[PDB]
Amino acid sequence: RHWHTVVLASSDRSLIEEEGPFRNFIQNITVESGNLNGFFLTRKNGQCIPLYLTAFKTEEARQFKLNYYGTNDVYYESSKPNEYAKFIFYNYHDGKVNVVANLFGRTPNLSNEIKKRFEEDFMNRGFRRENILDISEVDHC
Amino acid sequence: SRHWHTVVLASSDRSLIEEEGPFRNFIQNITVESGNLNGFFLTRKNGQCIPLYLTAFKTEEARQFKLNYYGTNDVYYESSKPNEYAKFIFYNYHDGKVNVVANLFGRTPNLSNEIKKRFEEDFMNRGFRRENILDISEVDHC
Ligand SMILES: CCc1ccc(O)cc1
Ligand SMILES: CCc1ccc(O)cc1
Ligand SMILES: [Cl-]
Ligand SMILES: [Cl-]
Ligand SMILES: [Cl-]
Ligand SMILES: [Cl-]
Ligand SMILES: [Cl-]
Ligand SMILES: [Zn+2]
Ligand SMILES: [Zn+2]
Ligand SMILES: [Zn+2]
Numbered sequence: 001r002h003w004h005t006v007v008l009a010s011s012d013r014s015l016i017e018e019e020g021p022f023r024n025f026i027q028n029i030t031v032e033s034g035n036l037n038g039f040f041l042t043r044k045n046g047q048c049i050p051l052y053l054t055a056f057k058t059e060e061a062r063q064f065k066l067n068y069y070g071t072n073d074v075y076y077e078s079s080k081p082n083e084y085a086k087f088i089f090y091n092y093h094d095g096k097v098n099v100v101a102n103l104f105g106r107t108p109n110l111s112n113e114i115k116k117r118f119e120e121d122f123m124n125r126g127f128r129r130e131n132i133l134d135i136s137e138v139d140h141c
Numbered sequence: 142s143r144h145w146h147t148v149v150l151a152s153s154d155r156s157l158i159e160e161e162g163p164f165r166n167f168i169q170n171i172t173v174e175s176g177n178l179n180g181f182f183l184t185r186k187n188g189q190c191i192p193l194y195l196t197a198f199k200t201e202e203a204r205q206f207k208l209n210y211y212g213t214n215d216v217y218y219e220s221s222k223p224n225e226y227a228k229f230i231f232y233n234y235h236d237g238k239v240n241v242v243a244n245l246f247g248r249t250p251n252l253s254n255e256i257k258k259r260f261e262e263d264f265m266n267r268g269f270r271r272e273n274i275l276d277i278s279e280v281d282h283c
Contacts, residue, residue: 011239060219062202071267077202090232090241092268097153097239099232125213126234 001028003085005140006110007103009122009132015091015100016133018043021069022089022100024051025141029085033057036064041141048141069093082106084114099125109136142173145227147282148252149245151264151274157233157242158275160185163211164231164242166193167283171227175199178206183283190283211235224248226256251278 005025008016015022024040031037034057041048055064055074064074070093077086089100103110103118119132147167150158157164166182173179176199183190197206197216206216212235219228231242245252245260261274 011234011237059221060204073267079201090239092153092241095153095268095270097232097241099234099239125215127237 001030002106003027003029003104004106004108005102006084006105006108006136007101007115007118007132007134009101009103009119009127010098011100011127011131012098013131013133015098022091025135026102026104043141080114084110086118105136142171144170144248145246146248146250147244148226148247148250148278149243149257149260149274149276151243151245151261151269153241153269153273155273155275157240164233167277168244168246185283222256226252228260247278 003026008023010016010022014020017023024042027039027041029036029038036055038053038055040051040053042051043049053066053068055066058065062076064076066072066074066089070091072092073090075088075090077088078084083106085104087102087104089102091098091100101118101122103115115134119129122132123129145168150165152158152164156162159165166184169181169183171178171180178197180195180197182193182195184193185191195208195210197208200207204218206218208214208216208231212233214234215232217230217232219230220226225248227246229244229246231244233240233242243260243264245257257276261271264274265271
């Protein structure tokens, strides 16, 4: 259940920048009744405050639904389930759609090969490198 | 995997599915080859129904495809009744902007009110207005 946020990427960089709604750092994930109960940390007023969310299962495997900053269609992917986890969030807020990609590792960092693939996959969709934030190299919660 | 009709279109940006919109295309058929989806659509251009052939390539994930059209697209297929209808959700990336276009296909020009109702409510439940849904089963199109 132990996880670390290693890379964040978004169509809207502000979503993952400081004070951003999706700049959350995963701590652990526990599966209950097929749902994903996530415990995250987020920074506010200088301190690390807990954030508990639940991504509910859907009729589709690896697809979940999450109510946060609007609604989100969440997709899980991983070729190495015990080494990393990739979660793609399609966020709908005020009629606006954005994609937020999360790369989780068992420890604070991940192999360059895994990070490179995640990053190139994001950029190949038509996004700039600047919209990728590798936080393994940052002092966060 | 064969004969289809576009019954309902819905999008985060209505201009995308309105007249002259890049996603206002009417499916005619889908042929599966090497796991890829070869689609044949019709599009209205200058009072003329012009053919549009596209291929959605398979990915490492089932029911997920990649399509190069009006930028890039992550395409997801869903259906509780595969022989009755097909739902395709397009996550379009155009000039750094993301939009969602949902397509509801039927074996014939129209679909049950139940199926259309669920499709439409699922769309609106995500935070979109009813006006962004276009039921084209009630309009003369290609
Ligand atoms: C990062 C994916 C996720 C979101 C919410 C949640 O509760 C658990 C996992
Ligand atoms: C509407 C889904 C679809 C897109 C492209 C394609 O080639 C086949 C099906
Ligand atoms: Cl660790
Ligand atoms: Cl630790
Ligand atoms: Cl626009
Ligand atoms: Cl028919
Ligand atoms: Cl027909
Ligand atoms: Zn750790
Ligand atoms: Zn527009
Ligand atoms: Zn027909």
